[PDB]
Design a binder for these strands. Structure first.
Lengths: 115, 61, 177, 87
RNA sequence: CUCAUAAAGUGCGUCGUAGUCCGGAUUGGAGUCUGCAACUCGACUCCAUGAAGUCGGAAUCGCUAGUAAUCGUGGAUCAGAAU
């Protein structure tokens, strides 16, 4: 069934099925089933409507999806706008050398590539 | 450093004479010193290889 | 019902304190285009079935399959392939689905936020972002296989960012800053 | 790419006392001249003042800052930002 | 006295053929340890990510018995990159 943000674990145990989530893993898979009181050896197709309900609400309170990916993008954007080499490394569109990369470097690059 | 090496000061603070510690004479490291030589584990080795330490010799197998 | 007061009552009030102009231009009729989430890729010959078989329960009529104009371009496109499948029409229907959509069922999802980011910037067509699992007062709890998550659009002819979204927060909540 | 090998540099006149203050927590802002030194664990949480060449600027070291030199957080030149200089 | 738990093995339970509870590359975050000190140059632990790969075009290599093949363990060098 569907729990968090876009996830459809089908035909598998309650444990391994939840392991397919970007946020929770094995450690979290066991603790959640123990808190909601659910058999870990039961398939997702054998779970009742009441069991899944208590599973969604609890697993709900967690961090996942886009909102998290934007936090990552921002983290890479902050050191990118500054004078940090690591940020320039993320781009790697910078000079790898020791001569100039800005111009006159076609002897290694080859034909001019589109901007 | 120059501030931590207050050990050089013969007279300890409020603490009893027991306050006086050790500190290496060469590097000035308090971690692991060797009373006999007063040098740290790092300096005793460097001084050993150089041969500046009399009577000292590298043990062999 | 609660849909008439808007456009005769709450359209003059929102055009007096921060406008000072005529009575029209802000906001008419004209159909509202309802698009579909790219069916391509997903799977093979099907899904077009579980389509028009769900987009025929929320509203009336069925979607029409239409191809493109037979004219090859600089892209992998053959002659005679069904791409698009769009059907938008109105009259007086596109009014009720702005009531039973943003009143009940929400709040009543499972983990709704509340704070939305600045969708549009220099136009009118807002934007959106919804997930695959939704709880509607017009959909069965146990009998529908494969959850469907579709967006929500709105066409407007505004001129400034403000003097807008001041009519959206007049019924369709929430929206914190 | 940076360079280290295995000989990270930490001026002894800014690494031994910084450890002193560790006797019972940390100590108020300090001032070091050699920005060449690199930032490491112990220095976390403390406020070291780097010399730009004119004065000492307070640089609150953080775990995220660990690894970079003290000089990297002490700008040499001074640009006003001729404008509204917002954000 | 300790490093030690030997591993495969045995008993019981679990997983279904899909790039998968196959496979682990890469990368993000946190941390331990050695060392004066590991941002190009460490090893290791945990979480997250989880690629190529579904067995391979022309030639060519190793062996006749507890040996082949296969599995795990201790040691010399030694503070620490031995697959």
């Amino acid at each position: 069934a569907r729990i968090a943000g876009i996830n459809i674990p089908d035909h598998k145990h309650a444990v391994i099925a939840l392991t397919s989530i970007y946020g929770v893993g094995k450690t979290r898979s066991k603790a959640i089933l123990a808190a909601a009181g659910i058999a870990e050896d039961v398939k997702i197709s054998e779970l009742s409507e009441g069991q899944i309900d208590t599973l969604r609400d609890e697993v709900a309170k967690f961090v996942v999806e886009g909102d998290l990916r934007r936090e990552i993008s921002m983290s890479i954007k902050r050191l990118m706008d500054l004078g940090c080499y690591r940020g320039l490394r993320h781009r790697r569109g910078l000079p790898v050398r020791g001569q100039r990369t800005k111009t006159n470097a076609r002897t290694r690059k080859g034909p001019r590539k589109p901007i | 450093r120059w501030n931590a090496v207050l050990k050089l000061q013969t007279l300890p603070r409020d603490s009893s004479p027991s306050r006086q510690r050790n500190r290496c004479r060469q590097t000035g490291r308090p971690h692991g010193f060797l009373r006999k030589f007063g040098l740290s584990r790092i300096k005793v080795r460097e001084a050993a290889m150089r041969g500046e330490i009399p009577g000292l010799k590298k043990a062999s197998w | 019902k609660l849909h008439d007061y808007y456009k005769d009552e709450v359209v003059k009030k929102l055009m007096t304190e921060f406008n000072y102009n005529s009575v029209m231009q802000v906001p008419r009729v004209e159909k509202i285009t309802l698009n579909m989430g790219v069916g391509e890729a997903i799977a093979d010959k099907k899904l077009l079935d579980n389509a028009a078989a769900d987009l025929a329960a929320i509203s009336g009529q069925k979607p029409l399959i239409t191809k493109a104009r037979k004219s090859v371009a600089g892209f992998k496109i053959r002659q005679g392939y069904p791409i698009g499948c769009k059907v938008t029409l109105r009259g007086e229907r596109m009014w009720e689905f702005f009531e039973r959509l943003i009143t009940i069922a929400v709040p009543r999802i499972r983990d709704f936020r509340g704070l939305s980011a600045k969708s549009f910037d220099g136009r009118g067509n807002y934007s959106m972002g919804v997930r695959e699992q939704i709880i509607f007062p017009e959909i069965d709890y146990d009998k529908v296989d494969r959850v469907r998550g579709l967006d929500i659009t709105i066409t407007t002819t505004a001129k400034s960012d403000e003097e807008g979204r001041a009519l959206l927060a007049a019924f369709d909540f929430p929206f914190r800053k | 790419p940076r360079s280290l090998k295995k000989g990270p540099f930490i001026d002894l006149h800014l690494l031994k006392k910084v450890e002193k203050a560790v006797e019972s927590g940390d100590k108020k802002p300090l001032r070091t001249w050699s920005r060449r030194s690199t930032i490491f664990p112990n220095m976390i949480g403390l406020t070291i003042a780097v010399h730009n060449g004119r004065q000492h600027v307070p640089v609150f070291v953080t775990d995220e800052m660990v690894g970079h030199k003290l000089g990297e957080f002490a700008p040499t030149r001074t640009y006003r930002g001729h404008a509204a200089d917002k954000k």
